[PDB]
Amino acid sequence: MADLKAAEVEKAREHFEIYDWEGEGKIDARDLGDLLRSLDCKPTLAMVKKNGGSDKRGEKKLTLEEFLPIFSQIKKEKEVGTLEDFMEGLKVYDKAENGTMLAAELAHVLLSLGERLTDIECEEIMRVCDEDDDGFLKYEPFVKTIIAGPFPDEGK
Shortest Cβ 29–other proteins spacing (Å) = 25
- In the complex with other proteins, the residue whose CB is nearer, 7 or 113, is 7
Among 4, 90, 103, 137, binds other proteins (CB under 8 A): 4
CB of 27 to other proteins, least distance (A): 18
Buried b (16+ CB within 10 A) or exposed e, 32-45: bbebbeebeeebee
The answer to whether the CB of 70 falls within 8 A of the CB of 51 is yes
For residues 70-109, which are near other proteins according to CB under 8 A? none
Q: Cα–Cα distances in Å, from 75 out to 39, 40, 68, 127?
A: 11, 10, 11, 34
Residues 11-70 that bind other proteins (CB under 8 A): 13
Candidate ranges 7-15, 84-92, 99-107, 119-127; the one touching other proteins (CB under 8 A): 7-15
CA distance 20 to 85: 38
1 lies in the binding site for other proteins (CB under 8 A)? yes
Is the backbone peptide bond immediately before 114 cis, with ω within 30 degrees of 0? Answer: no
The binding site for other proteins (CB under 8 A) comprises 1-10, 13
